[PDB]
Amino acid sequence: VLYNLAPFFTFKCYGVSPTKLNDLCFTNVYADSFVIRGDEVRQIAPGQTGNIADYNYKLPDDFTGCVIAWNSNKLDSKVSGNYNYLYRLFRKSNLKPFER
């Protein structure tokens, strides 16, 4: 039912294939809901670091799964400039995968 919008641009899928999506049975799906700009969407890929990723979210090298996403800016962004979105960039150090 999700094959109806063009702005899905993250069809690169590492653990399995998007053609093999509804092909084999899965045990326990793990979904994490958040918003990342497309400037560092290539840093989301396993085996890669960056800065926003280096400080808040981490991904395993054996990325069992893959992400679907469309344009957030169209969804939320006031005419005065969306300053409502807040982030954190100045922690002590990095973090291991699957902690917060």
Epitope: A6, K78, V79, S80, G81
Partner: antibody, heavy 118, light 109 residues
Framework: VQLVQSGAEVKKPGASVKVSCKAS????????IHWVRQAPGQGPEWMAI????????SYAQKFQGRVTLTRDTSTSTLYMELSSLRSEDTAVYYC??????????????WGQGTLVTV | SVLTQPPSASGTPGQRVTISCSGS????????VYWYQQLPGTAPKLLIY???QRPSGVPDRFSGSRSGTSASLAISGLRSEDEADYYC?????????????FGGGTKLT
């Protein structure tokens, strides 16, 4: 439910101009205004957005940092200041009226425009 | 894009002429298309909403659609008062900048 402009004349080069337009009718804080300039012999270009209430602003890339905006609801005027006027900036200014509560919207009828020359 | 438009579009009374604004990807293909009518000596005015029906009220002589990266509009019944020019408005979403890009100019007799 109508919009009117102000008057303008020839200004000296290397100066700043100020445009104000008045509106009447619907709620001032429940609508959005585009700021456009039309040059003779060429198509119009949109630069600035109006956010009434908090008076928020956003401009284009080629016209940012030289442009000053002031918005208020009690006076219901839009003080639209352009700086560093040159001979290429001879265009008719218009304050539009969007669909409301979104930049993505449809255009209401405009006013009469303000003409400045250098 | 830059909304390329033909410089003129001549015609005769009783004849229908199709005039189009041609763009590119992420401006006409995904974003909506606008058509606005400017009369000489007066304020800028609107011609059409989204290309399905009349904006507020007009006979069905004015109609148009879109295809690929272009938006076409057919005008029939040329009159003396019909002499004006037209503009195309669409969402740009270009690289490092998203200003409302318009078209060039057209001539109707």
């Amino acid at each position: 439910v109508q919009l009117v402009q102000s008057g303008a004349e020839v200004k000296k080069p290397g100066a700043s101009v100020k445009v104000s337009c008045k509106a009447s009718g619907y709620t001032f804080s429940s609508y959005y205004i585009h700021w456009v300039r039309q040059a003779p012999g060429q198509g119009p270009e949109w630069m600035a957005i109006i956010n009434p209430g908090d008076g928020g602003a956003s401009y284009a890339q080629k016209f940012q940092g030289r442009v000053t905006l002031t918005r208020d609801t009690s006076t219901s005027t839009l003080y639209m200041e352009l700086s560093s006027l040159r001979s290429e900036d001879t265009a008719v200014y218009y304050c539009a009226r969007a669909e409301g509560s979104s930049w993505l919207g449809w255009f209401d009828p405009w006013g009469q425009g303000t003409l400045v020359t250098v | 894009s830059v909304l390329t438009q033909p410089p003129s579009a001549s015609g005769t009374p009783g004849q229908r002429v199709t005039i189009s604004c041609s763009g590119s990807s992420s401006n006409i293909g995904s974003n909506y298309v606008y058509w606005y009518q400017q009369l000489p000596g007066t304020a800028p005015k609107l011609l059409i909403y989204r290309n399905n029906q009349r904006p507020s009220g007009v006979p069905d002589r004015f109609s148009g659609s879109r295809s690929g990266t272009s938006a076409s509009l057919a005008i029939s019944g040329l009159r003396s008062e019909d002499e004006a020019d037209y503009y195309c408005a669409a969402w740009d979403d270009g690289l490092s900048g998203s200003g409302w890009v318009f078209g060039g100019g057209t001539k109707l007799t």
